[PDB]
Coordinates of C-alpha atoms and ligand atoms in Angstrom, one line a residue:
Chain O
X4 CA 0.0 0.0 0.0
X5 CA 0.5 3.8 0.0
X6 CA 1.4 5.0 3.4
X7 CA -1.4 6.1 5.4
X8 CA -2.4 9.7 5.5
X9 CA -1.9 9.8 9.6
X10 CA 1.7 8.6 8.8
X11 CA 1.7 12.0 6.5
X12 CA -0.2 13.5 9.3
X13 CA 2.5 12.9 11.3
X14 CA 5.4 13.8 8.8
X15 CA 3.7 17.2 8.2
X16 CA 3.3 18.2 11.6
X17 CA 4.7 21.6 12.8
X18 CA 7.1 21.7 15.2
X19 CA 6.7 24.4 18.2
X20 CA 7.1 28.1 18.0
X21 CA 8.0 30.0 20.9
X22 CA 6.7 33.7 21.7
X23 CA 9.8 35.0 22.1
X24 CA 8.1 36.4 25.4
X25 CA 10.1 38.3 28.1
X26 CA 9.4 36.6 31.6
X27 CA 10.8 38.9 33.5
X28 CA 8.0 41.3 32.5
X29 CA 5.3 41.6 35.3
X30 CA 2.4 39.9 34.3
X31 CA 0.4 42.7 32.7
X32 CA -3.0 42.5 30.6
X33 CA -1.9 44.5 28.1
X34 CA 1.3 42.8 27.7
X35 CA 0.3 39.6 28.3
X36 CA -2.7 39.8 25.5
X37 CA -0.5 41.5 22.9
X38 CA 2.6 38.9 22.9
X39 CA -0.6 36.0 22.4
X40 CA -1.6 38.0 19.6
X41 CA 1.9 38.0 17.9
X42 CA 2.2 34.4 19.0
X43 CA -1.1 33.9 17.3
X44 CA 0.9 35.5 14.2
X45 CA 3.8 33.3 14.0
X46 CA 1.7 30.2 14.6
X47 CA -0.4 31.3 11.6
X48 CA 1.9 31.0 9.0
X49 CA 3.1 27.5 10.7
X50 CA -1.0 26.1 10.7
X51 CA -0.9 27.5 6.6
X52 CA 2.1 25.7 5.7
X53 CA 0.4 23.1 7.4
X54 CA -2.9 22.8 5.5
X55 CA -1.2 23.4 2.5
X56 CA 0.7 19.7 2.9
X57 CA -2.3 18.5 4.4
X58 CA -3.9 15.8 1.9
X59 CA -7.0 17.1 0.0
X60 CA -6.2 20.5 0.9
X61 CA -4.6 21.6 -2.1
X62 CA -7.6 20.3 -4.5
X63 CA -10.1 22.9 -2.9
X64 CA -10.8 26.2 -4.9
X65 CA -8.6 28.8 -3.3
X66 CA -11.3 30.6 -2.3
X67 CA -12.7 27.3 -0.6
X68 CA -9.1 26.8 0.8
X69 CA -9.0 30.5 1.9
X70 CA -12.3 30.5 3.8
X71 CA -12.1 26.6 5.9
X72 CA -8.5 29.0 7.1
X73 CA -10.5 32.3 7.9
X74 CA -12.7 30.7 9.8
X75 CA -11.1 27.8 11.3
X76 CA -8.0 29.1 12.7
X77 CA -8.6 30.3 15.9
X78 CA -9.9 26.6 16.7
X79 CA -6.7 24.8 15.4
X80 CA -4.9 27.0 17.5
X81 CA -6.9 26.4 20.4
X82 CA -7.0 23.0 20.2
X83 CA -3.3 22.6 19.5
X84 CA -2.4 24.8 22.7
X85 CA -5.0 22.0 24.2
X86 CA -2.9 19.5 23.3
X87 CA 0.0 20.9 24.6
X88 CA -1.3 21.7 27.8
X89 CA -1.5 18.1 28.0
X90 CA 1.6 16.9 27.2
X91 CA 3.6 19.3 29.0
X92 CA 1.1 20.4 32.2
X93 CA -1.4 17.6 32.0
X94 CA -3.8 19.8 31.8
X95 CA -2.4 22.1 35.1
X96 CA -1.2 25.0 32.8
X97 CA -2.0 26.5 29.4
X98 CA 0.5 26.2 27.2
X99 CA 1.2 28.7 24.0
X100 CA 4.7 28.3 23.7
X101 CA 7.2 26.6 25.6
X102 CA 8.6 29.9 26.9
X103 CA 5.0 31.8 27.4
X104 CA 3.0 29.5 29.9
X105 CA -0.3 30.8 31.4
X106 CA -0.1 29.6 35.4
X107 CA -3.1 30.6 37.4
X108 CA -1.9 34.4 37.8
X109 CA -1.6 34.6 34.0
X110 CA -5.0 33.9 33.4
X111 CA -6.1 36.0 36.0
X112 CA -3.8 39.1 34.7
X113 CA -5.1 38.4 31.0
X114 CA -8.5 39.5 31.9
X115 CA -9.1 36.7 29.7
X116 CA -9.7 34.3 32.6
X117 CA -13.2 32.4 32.5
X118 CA -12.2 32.4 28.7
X119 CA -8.5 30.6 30.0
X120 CA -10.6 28.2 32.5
X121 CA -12.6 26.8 29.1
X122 CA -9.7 26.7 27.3
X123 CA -8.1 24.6 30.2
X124 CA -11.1 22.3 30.5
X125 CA -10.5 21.4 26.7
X126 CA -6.8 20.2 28.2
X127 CA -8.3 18.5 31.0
X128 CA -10.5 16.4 28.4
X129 CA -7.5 15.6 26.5
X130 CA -6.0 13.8 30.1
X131 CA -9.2 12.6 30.8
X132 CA -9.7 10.3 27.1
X133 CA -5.8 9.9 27.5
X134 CA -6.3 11.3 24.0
X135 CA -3.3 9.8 21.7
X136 CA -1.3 11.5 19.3
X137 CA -3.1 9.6 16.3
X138 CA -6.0 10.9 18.0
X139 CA -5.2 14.3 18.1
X140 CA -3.8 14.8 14.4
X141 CA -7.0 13.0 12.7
X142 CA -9.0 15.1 15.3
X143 CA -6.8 18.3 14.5
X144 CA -7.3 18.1 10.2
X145 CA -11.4 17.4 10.7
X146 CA -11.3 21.0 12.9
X147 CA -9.8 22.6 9.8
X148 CA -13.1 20.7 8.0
X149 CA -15.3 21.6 10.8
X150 CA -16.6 25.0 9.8
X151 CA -17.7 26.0 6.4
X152 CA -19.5 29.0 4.2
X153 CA -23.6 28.5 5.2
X154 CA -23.9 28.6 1.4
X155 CA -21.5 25.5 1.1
X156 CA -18.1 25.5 -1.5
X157 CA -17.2 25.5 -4.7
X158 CA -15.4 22.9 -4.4
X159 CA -17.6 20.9 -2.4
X160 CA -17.3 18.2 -4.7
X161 CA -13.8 17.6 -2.8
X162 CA -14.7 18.4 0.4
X163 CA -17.0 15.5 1.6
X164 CA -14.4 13.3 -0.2
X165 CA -11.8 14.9 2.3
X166 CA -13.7 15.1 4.9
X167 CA -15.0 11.6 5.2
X168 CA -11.6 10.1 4.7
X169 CA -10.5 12.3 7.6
X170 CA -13.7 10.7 9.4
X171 CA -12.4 7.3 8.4
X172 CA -8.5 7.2 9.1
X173 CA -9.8 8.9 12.9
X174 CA -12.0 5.7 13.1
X175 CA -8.6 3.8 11.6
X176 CA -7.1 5.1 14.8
X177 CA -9.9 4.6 17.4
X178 CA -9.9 1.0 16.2
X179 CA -5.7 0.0 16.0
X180 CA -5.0 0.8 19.6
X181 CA -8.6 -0.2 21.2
X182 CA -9.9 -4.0 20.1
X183 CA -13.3 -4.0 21.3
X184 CA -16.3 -2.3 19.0
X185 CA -18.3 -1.5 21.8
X186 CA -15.1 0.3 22.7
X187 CA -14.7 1.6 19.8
X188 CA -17.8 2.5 19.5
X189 CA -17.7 5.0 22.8
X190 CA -14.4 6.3 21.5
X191 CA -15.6 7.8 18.9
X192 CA -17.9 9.5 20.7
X193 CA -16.3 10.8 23.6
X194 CA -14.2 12.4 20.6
X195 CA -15.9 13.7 18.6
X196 CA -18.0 15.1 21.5
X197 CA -14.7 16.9 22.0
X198 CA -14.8 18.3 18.3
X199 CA -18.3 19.3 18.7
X200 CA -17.4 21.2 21.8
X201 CA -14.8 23.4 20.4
X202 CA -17.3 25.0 18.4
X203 CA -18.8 27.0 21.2
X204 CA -15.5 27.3 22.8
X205 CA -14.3 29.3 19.7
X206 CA -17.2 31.2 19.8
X207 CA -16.7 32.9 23.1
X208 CA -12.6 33.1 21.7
X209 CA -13.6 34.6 19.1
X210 CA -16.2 36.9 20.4
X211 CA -13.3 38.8 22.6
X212 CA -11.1 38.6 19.9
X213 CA -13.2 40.7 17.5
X214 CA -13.6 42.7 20.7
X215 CA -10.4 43.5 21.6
X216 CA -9.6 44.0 18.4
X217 CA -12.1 46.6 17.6
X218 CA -11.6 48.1 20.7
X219 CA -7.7 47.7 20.1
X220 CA -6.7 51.5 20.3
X221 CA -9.5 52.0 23.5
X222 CA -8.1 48.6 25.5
X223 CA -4.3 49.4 23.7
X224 CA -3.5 45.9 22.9
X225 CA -1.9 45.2 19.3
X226 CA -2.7 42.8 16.6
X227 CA 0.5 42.6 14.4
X228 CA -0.1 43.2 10.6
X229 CA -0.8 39.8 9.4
X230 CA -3.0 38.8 12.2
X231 CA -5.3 42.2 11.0
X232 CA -5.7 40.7 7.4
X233 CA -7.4 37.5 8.5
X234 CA -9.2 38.8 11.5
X235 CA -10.4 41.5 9.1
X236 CA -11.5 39.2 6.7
X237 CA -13.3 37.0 9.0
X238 CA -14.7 38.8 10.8
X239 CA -17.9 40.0 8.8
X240 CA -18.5 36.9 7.5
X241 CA -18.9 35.6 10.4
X242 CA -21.5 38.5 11.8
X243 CA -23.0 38.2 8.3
X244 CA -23.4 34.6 9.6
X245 CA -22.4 32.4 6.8
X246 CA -20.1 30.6 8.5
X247 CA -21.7 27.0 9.8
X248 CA -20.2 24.8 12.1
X249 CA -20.5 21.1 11.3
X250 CA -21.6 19.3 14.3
X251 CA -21.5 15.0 15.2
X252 CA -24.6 15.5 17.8
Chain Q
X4 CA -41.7 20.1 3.5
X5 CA -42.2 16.5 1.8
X6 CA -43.8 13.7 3.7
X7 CA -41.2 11.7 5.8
X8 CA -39.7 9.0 4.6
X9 CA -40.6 7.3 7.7
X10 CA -44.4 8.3 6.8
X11 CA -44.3 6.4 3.6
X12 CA -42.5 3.5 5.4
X13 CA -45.6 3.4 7.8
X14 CA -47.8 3.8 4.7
X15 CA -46.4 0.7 2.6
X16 CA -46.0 -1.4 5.8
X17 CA -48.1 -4.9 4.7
X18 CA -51.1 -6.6 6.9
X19 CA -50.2 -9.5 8.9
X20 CA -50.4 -12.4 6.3
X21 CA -52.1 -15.5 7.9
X22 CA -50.7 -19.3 7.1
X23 CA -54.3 -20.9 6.9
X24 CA -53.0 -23.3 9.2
X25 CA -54.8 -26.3 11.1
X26 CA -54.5 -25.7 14.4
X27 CA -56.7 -29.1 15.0
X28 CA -53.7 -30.9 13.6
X29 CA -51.0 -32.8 15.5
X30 CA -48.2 -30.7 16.0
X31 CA -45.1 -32.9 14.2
X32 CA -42.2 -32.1 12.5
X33 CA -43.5 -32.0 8.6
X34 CA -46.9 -30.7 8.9
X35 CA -45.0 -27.4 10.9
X36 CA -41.6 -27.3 8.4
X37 CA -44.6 -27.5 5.6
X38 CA -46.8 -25.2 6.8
X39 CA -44.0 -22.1 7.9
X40 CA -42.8 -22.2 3.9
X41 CA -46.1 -22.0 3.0
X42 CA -46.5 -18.7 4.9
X43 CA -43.0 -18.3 4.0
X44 CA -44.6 -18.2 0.4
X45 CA -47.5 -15.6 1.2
X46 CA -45.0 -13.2 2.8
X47 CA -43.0 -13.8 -0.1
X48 CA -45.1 -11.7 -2.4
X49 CA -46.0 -9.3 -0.1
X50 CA -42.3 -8.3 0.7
X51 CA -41.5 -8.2 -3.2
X52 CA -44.6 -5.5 -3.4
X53 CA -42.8 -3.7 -0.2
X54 CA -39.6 -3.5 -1.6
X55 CA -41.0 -1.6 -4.9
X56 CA -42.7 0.2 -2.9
X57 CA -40.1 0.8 -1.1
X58 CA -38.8 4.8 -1.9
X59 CA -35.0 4.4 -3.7
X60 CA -35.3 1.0 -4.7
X61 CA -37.1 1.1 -7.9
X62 CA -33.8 3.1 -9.2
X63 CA -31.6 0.8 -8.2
X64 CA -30.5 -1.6 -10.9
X65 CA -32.8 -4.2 -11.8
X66 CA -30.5 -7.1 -10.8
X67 CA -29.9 -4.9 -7.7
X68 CA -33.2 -5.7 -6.8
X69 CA -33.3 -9.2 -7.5
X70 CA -30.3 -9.6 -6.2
X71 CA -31.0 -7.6 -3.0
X72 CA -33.9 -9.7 -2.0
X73 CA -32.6 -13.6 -2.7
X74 CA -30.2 -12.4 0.1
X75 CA -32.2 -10.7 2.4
X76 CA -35.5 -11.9 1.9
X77 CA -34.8 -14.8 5.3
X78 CA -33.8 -11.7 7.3
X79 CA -36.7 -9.7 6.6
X80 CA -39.6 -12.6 7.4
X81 CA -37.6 -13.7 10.5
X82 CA -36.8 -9.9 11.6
X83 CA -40.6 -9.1 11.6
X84 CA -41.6 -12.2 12.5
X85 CA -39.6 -11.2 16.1
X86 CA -41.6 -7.8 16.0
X87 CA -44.7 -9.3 16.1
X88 CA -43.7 -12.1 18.8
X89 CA -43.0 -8.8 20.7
X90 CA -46.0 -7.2 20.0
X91 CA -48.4 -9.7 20.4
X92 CA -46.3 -12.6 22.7
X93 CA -44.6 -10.3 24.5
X94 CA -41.5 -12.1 22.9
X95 CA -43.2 -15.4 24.8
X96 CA -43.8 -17.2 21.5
X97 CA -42.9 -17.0 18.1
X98 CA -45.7 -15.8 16.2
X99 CA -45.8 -16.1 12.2
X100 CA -48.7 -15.7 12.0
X101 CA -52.0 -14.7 14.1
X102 CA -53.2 -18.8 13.2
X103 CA -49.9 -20.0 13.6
X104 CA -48.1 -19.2 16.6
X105 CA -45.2 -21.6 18.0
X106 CA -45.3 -22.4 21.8
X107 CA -42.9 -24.6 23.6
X108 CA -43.9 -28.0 22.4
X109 CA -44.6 -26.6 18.7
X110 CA -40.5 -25.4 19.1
X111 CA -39.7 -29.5 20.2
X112 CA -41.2 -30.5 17.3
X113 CA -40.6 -28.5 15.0
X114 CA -37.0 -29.9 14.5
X115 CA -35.4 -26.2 15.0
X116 CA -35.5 -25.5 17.9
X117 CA -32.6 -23.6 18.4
X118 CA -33.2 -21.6 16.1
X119 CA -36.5 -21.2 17.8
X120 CA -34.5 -20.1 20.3
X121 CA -32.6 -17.6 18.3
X122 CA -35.7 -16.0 17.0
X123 CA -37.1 -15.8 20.8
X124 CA -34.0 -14.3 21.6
X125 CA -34.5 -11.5 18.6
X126 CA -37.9 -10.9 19.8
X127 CA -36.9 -10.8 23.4
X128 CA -34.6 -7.8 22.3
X129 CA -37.4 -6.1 21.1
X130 CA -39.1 -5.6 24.3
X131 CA -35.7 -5.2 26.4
X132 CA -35.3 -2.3 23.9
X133 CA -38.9 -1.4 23.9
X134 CA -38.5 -0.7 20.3
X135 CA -40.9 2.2 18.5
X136 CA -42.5 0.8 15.4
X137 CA -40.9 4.0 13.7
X138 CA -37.6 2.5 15.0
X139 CA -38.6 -0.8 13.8
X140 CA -39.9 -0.1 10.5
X141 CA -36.8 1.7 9.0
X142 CA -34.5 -1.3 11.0
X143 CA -36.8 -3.4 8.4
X144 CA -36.1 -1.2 5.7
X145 CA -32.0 -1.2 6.6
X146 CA -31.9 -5.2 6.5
X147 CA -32.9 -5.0 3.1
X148 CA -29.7 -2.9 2.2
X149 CA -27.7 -4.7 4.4
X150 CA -26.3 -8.1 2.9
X151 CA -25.0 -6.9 -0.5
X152 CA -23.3 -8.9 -3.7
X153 CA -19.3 -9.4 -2.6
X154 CA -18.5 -8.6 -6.2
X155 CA -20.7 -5.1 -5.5
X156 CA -23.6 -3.3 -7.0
X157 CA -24.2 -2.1 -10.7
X158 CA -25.2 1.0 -9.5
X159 CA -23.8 1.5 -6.2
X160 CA -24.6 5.0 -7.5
X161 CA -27.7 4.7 -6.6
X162 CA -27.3 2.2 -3.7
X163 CA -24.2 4.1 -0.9
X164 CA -26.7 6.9 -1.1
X165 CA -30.1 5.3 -0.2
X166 CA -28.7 3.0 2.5
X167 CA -27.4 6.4 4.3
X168 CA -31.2 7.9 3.8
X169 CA -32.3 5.3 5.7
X170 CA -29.6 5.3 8.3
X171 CA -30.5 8.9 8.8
X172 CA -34.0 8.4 8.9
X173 CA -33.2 6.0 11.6
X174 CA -31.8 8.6 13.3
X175 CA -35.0 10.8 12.6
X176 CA -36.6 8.4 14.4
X177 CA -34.3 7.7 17.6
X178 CA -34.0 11.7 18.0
X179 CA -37.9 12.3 18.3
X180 CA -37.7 10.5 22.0
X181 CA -36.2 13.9 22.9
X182 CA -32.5 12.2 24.6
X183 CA -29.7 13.9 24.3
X184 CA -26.9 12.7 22.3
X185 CA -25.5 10.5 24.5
X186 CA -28.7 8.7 25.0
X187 CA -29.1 8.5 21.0
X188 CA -25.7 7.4 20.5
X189 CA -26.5 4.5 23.0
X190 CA -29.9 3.6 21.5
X191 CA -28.3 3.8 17.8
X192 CA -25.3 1.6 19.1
X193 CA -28.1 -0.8 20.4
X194 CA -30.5 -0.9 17.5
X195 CA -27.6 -1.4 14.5
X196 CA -26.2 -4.3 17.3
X197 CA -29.7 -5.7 17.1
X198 CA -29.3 -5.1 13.6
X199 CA -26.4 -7.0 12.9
X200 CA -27.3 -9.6 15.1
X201 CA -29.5 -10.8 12.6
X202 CA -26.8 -12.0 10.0
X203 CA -25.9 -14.6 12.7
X204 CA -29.2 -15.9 12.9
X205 CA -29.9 -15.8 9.3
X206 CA -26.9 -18.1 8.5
X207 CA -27.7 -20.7 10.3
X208 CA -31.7 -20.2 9.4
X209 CA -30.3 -20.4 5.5
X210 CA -28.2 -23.8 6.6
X211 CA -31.6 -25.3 8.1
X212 CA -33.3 -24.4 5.1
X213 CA -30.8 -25.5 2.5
X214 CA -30.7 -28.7 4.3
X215 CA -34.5 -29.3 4.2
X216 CA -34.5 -28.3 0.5
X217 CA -32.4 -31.0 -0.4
X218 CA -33.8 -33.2 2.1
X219 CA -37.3 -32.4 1.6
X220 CA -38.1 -36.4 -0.4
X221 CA -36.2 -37.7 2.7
X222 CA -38.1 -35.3 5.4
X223 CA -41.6 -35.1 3.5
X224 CA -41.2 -31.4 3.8
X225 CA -42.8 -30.0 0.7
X226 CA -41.7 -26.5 -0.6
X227 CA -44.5 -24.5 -2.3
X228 CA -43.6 -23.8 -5.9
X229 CA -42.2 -20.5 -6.0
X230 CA -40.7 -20.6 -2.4
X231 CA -38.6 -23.0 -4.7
X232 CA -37.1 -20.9 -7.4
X233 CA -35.9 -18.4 -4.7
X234 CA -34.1 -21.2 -2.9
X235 CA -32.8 -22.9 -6.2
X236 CA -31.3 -19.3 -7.5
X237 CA -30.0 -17.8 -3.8
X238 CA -28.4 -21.4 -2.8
X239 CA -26.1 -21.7 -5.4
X240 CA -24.8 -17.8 -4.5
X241 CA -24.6 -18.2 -0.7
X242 CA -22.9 -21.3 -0.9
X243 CA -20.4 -19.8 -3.7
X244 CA -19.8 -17.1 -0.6
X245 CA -21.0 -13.8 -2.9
X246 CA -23.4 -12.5 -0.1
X247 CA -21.3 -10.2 2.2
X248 CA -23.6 -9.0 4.9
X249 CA -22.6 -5.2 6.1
X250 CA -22.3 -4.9 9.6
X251 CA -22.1 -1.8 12.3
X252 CA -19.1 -2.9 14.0
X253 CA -16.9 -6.5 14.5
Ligands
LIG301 C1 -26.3 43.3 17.4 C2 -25.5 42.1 16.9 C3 -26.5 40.9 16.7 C4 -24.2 41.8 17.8 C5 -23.7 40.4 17.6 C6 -22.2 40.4 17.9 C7 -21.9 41.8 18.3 C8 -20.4 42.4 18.0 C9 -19.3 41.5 18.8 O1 -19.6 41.5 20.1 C10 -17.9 42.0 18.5 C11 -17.7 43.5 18.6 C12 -17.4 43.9 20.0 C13 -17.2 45.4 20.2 O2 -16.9 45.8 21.5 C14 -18.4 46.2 19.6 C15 -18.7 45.8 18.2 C16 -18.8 44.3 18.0 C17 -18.7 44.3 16.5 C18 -20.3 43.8 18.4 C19 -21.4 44.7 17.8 C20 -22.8 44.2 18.1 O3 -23.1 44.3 19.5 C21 -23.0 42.7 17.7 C22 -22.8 42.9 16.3
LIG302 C1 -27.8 -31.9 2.0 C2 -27.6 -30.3 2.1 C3 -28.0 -29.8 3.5 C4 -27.4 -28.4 3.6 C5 -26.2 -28.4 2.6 C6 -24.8 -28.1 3.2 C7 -24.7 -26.8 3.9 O1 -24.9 -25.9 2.9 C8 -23.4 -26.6 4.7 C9 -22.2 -27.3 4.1 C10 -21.3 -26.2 3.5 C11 -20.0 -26.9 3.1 O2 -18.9 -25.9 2.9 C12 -20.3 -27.8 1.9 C13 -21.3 -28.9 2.3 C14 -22.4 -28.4 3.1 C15 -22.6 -29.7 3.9 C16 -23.7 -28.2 2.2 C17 -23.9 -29.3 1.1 C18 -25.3 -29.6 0.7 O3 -25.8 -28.5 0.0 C19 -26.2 -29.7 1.9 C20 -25.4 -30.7 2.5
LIG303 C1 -5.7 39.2 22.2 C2 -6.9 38.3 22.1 O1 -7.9 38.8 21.6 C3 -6.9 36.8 22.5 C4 -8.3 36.2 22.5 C5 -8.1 34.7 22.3 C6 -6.6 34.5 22.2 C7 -6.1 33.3 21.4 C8 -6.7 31.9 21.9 C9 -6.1 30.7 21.2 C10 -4.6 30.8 21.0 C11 -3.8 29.5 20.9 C12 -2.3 29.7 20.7 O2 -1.6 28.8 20.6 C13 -1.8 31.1 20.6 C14 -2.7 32.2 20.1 C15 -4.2 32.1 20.4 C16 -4.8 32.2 19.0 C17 -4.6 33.2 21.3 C18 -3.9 34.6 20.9 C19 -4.5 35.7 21.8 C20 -6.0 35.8 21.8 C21 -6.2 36.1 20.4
LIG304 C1 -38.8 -25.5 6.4 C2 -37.6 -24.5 6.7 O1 -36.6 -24.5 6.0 C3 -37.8 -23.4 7.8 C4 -36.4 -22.9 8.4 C5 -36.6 -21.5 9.0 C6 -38.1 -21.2 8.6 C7 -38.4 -19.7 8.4 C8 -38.0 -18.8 9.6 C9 -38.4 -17.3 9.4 C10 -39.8 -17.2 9.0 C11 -40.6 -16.0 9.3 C12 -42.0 -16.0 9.0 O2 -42.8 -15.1 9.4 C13 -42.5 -17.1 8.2 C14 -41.5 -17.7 7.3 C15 -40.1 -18.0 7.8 C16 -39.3 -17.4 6.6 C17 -39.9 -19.5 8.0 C18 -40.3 -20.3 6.8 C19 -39.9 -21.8 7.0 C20 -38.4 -22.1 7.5 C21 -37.8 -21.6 6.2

């Protein structure tokens, strides 16, 4: 055979980017929500790159490729910084980059903080399911496939394709560790609960984002240029409404 | 909107069939066998004349269809037949049909009776489930599209897309008890296990009743005339291994 897409999955995944974040800073709202945002700008390019060698991707009309990225980002990132809460806090601590960590004071500085608790609990699910790392990437590309224009693609041809494979090699992964179908069967549940749940997670995200970033000059937090663009873009289409979140339940 | 599919299912749902059986009659091994494939005969028709009316079938391929129902047609009888020994036995008894109902002693003699047993225990699940006859009907519809040609379908076009219709539908139906999604994740899990279940069943049913065909001279079992045919063209494919039955998890 041809090797399996979460062996690409795994070839293709980005390594870590740090903040370059000064600790020795107090821990400052302002500050604090202004290095995320150029963290957030870094880690953009890295989750574009990404998609880019991501199987399928590339086969989508640009504008179909452009849009599942406008719209989906913030929950990759989220749920990536989920992931590595896990790994490296078990859930204790959120972790952006491995040299800005949000203890409790963090998130109670970043004004943020009932925002950084959900975000958290997404971590604490991840140690919960003792989510593995097969888990996670599978889970990881159906996010990017997880929100889509209310008026559906162009290319939407490709896109079921894409996404039920994606659907498939998760189930691929449920079933190889697990034997057991009524195990399996409860897996993919508890999963793909967890997809559905990011959905309204990114919501409230999102809502402060286009809030702080309306706000920007009042509240005096920046969003560095790149990080504009795509908020920009998103940002009415998303308060026009058509963007529609593909739910399991 | 346009009526529910599960609305037309309810529509084209056929009345009992009843096995003019004499009931007066000593129960023993031949005169049962005989009289079940005479009913077997009745429901026959009756599940052709469901199937076309069944909505997505008619565009399937015309040797689809016939296909299709040589497989499945032991499924359907026997999955219904459990319904009804739900329904009107409380899964007590194995009811065929309203004259024709096997108790205990008619299971001794019948010369199956563990598969007796295997059809009380499908009925049995039935009323642990306390399954809705919305539930039940597109389950019905479902074992149709669920034991295929191995080789595959001429149109498959048509085929992949139905069978997911009614797999939604089914979960049209599970929803309406207002659960959450948990709950209807745990009744779908349970009805598609029910479900498959019956491939189990059915193969050995099929063995019981190849034998008997065969057999019948020896076991004075006589096989209504088109009951025949079915047998004669669906043997020869089952025992050749072309029937792949598609299941809802290993
Ligand atoms: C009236 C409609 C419906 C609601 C739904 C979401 C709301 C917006 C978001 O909150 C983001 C942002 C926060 C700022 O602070 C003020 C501006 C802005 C654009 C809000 C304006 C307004 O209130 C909105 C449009
Ligand atoms: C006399 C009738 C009764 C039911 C039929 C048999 C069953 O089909 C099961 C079995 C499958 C094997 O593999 C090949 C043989 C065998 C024994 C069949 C051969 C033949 O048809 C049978 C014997
Ligand atoms: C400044 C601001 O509005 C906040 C609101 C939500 C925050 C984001 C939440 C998700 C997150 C995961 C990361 O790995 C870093 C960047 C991001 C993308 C955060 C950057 C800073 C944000 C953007
Ligand atoms: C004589 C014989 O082979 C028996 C074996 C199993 C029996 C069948 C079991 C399932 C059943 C359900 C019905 O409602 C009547 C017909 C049938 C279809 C039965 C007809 C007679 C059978 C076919």
């Amino acid at each position: 055979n041809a090797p399996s897409l979460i062996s690409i999955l795994q070839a293709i995944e980005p390594e870590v980017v740090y903040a370059g974040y000064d600790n020795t800073q107090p821990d400052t709202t302002n500050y604090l929500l202004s290095s995320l945002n150029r963290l957030a700008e870094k880690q953009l390019v890295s989750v574009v790159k990404w998609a880019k060698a991501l199987p399928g991707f590339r086969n989508l009309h640009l504008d179909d490729q452009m849009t599942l990225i406008q719209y989906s980002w913030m929950g990759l990132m989220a749920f990536a910084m989920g992931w590595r809460s896990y790994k490296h806090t078990n859930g204790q601590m959120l972790y952006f980059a491995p040299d800005l960590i949000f203890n409790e004071q963090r998130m109670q500085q970043s004004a943020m903080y009932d925002l950084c608790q959900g975000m958290q609990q997404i971590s604490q699910e991840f140690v919960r399911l003792q989510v593995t790392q097969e888990e996670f990437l599978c889970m990881k590309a159906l996010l990017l496939l997880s929100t889509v224009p209310k008026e559906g693609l162009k290319s939407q041809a490709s896109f079921d394709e894409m996404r039920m494979n994606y659907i498939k090699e998760l189930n691929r992964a449920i079933a190889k560790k697990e034997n057991n179908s009524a195990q399996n069967w409860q897996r993919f549940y508890q999963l793909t609960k967890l997809l559905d749940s990011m959905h309204d997670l990114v919501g409230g995200l999102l809502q402060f984002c286009f809030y702080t970033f309306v706000q920007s000059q009042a509240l005096s937090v920046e969003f560095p240029e790149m990080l504009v663009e795509i908020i920009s873009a998103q940002l009415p289409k998303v308060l026009a409404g058509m963007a529609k979140p593909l739910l399991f339940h």
